Amino acid sequence: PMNDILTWLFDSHMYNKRQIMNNQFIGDPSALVVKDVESKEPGKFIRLR
């Protein structure tokens, strides 16, 4: 039983981490120039505020 409590505890942890931890963004695509956001370069100037 004590071993089982261990299994739930660990499992719940990894499982919750898997579902959420990811880097994502929120924004309105009406104003941004889409082509620009996708690109990866050392310096870029996306356009607008």
Partner: protein, 202 residues
């Protein structure tokens, strides 16, 4: 709308006027051009890909007939003998002075006023293709798209005009009407471009 229901609508809404049909016509035409000169541009005015043939030893390139602006997402492309090409890049004339007196395929394009410019001078005959917004008249399309799209904007704005010449109060009521329609139009345009694209941060 068939360019005839427009004048009928103008008469009907204006108060069932009868004998101004020539005037109506002059005005509707005066109007489409004005709206075209406006700073906003709708979505039906991009031309089919048009290309230009350039002769060697010349840097400046004449602007297309009735040009308005380039396409935000489209660029000059050169098509070589093999059929493939490369996308040229643009910069202010100042930054492009350095390649003066150099040899190769073209690489940079600059606006000037009426003339594009190629500073890496192509020593031989060459061609590029563009995607640009053009004046309504120039476009081949059998019929005016403005007639089909947002005919209400058109109806309203001309009515304002005659009414302004008639020094009547409701000129504004119509002006305001044009505006709502104009704003909505921009929303349609912006709404449509991004309809099914997925962005990623890279």
């Amino acid at each position: 709308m068939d360019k005839a229901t427009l004048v009928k609508t103008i008469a009907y809404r204006m108060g069932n006027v009868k004998g101004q049909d020539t005037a109506i016509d002059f005005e509707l035409a005066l109007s489409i051009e004005r709206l075209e000169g406006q700073e906003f541009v709708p979505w039906f005015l991009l031309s089919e890909n048009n290309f230009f043939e350039g002769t060697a030893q010349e840097n400046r390139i004449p602007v297309p007939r009735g040009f308005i602006r380039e396409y935000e997402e489209g660029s000059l492309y050169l098509r070589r003998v093999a059929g493939t090409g490369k996308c040229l890049i643009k910069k202010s004339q100042d930054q492009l002075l350095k390649y003066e007196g150099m040899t190769g395929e073209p690489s940079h394009y600059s606006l000037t006023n009426q003339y594009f410019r190629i500073y890496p001078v192509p020593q031989e005959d060459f061609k590029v293709e563009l995607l640009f917004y053009r004046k309504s008249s120039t476009l081949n399309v059998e019929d005016n798209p403005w007639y089909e799209y947002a005919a209400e904007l058109l109806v309203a704005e001309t009515i304002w005009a005659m009414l302004s010449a008639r020094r009547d109060k409701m000129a504004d009521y119509w002006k305001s009407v044009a505006a709502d329609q104009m704003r909505r139009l921009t929303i349609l345009d912006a709404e449509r471009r991004l309809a099914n694209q997925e962005i990623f941060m890279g």
